[PDB]
Amino acid sequence: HMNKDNLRSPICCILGHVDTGKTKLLDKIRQTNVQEGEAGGITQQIGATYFPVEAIKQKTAVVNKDGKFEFKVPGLLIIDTPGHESFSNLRSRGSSLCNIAILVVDIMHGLEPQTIESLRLLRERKTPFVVALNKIDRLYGWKKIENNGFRESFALQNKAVQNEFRNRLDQVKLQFAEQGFNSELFYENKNFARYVSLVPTSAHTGEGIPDMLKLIVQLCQERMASSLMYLSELQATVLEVKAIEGFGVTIDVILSNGILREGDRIVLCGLEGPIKTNIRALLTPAPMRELRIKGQYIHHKEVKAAQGVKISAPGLEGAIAGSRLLVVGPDDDEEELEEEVES
Length: 343
Ligand SMILES: Nc1nc2c(ncn2[C@@H]2O[C@H](COP(=O)(O)OP(=O)(O)OP(=O)(O)O)[C@@H](O)[C@H]2O)c(=O)[nH]1
Ligand SMILES: [Mg+2]
Ligand code: NA
Known about the structure:
Elements: E1 11-16, H1 22-30, H2 34-37, E2 47-52, H3 53-59, E3 75-80, H4 88-97, E4 100-106, H5 113-125, E5 129-134, H6 150-155, H7 159-178, E6 183-185, E7 196-200, H8 209-222, E8 235-244, E9 248-257, E10 259-261, E11 265-270, E12 273-278, E13 281-284, E14 298-299, E15 302-304, E16 307-312, E17 325-327, H9 334-342
Parallel strand pairs: 1-3, 1-4, 4-5, 5-7, 6-7
Antiparallel strand pairs: 2-3, 8-9, 9-16, 10-15, 11-12, 11-17, 13-14, 13-16
Helix pairs in contact: 4-5
This protein binds guanosine-5'-triphosphate, magnesium ion and sodium ion.
């Protein structure tokens, strides 16, 4: 059960204080404009985007020029979350689902109250994480090269920008120390297993994003439990219940482990008790496009974990957000399964 056909795409949740750039970072990677469409310019829902490893390899090429860094994951599911204070429930749900995370910190502001909240979530679950120290283009006099690696661009800055960067970096490290986290600028980190790496980024210029992407793959491959690199028993969670044109009442689901198939008999929790139904359509967005955004869906016979899927099935009207979802297998009893989800 440790073969290429059995590889699992892990889950990375992005967390941070409001307006720190979490969505803008993902828009730069995806080449989308989700943030410009958001009411108030704020995220109000959990979003999910799947990144195939081919795309991650291309977007890290400028910090892997000789092609030698070994990519072992087949891809990565990235869960976007709200930073606004009123959405603590959704940060908790996203954090609960992830295997690794990116914590976004505005380099201009340092740690802020929902950063502290997010650090509590990360500590509680022992989640490996990297920090995107974002908005470096706001360093006064920053000269950009679009989508460059951070070190190459940093070497081209004037002495004032380099000094400002180091002063802000040192302040942020002291703040993380006050919260009980040792942190290092990523290329100064000699203990990747225990110290938090700080990777400076700009979602506007793209700089440092190649470093950030390489680092989250390294988190998957070198800090996450190895067993999570491979598919095991199905695990899935309902995110939302949504009525959709043509498909009727659907559920959006994070498939955390295992494999879902069209036609599967599924059991989940409903307002009046267990719901048992069959998957009529098993849908995803296009790769590198958001689950939380209306678009044309791709229909699949099979979806391997992790992914964000939309399921069309009769009888989903009472489904409960946060419910687990099970599949009735050949040796399962359908009625016995209903209780298991129940408790
Ligand atoms: N100058 C600069 N502005 C940025 C950067 N990243 C984000 N912004 C701006 O900061 C504002 C907030 O960006 P968002 O992507 O909404 O941040 P967020 O963390 O997703 O916000 P919530 O999901 O609402 O918590 C927007 O106006 C962005 O254009 C950056 O690297 N540099
Ligand atoms: Mg956002
Ligand atoms: Na925002």
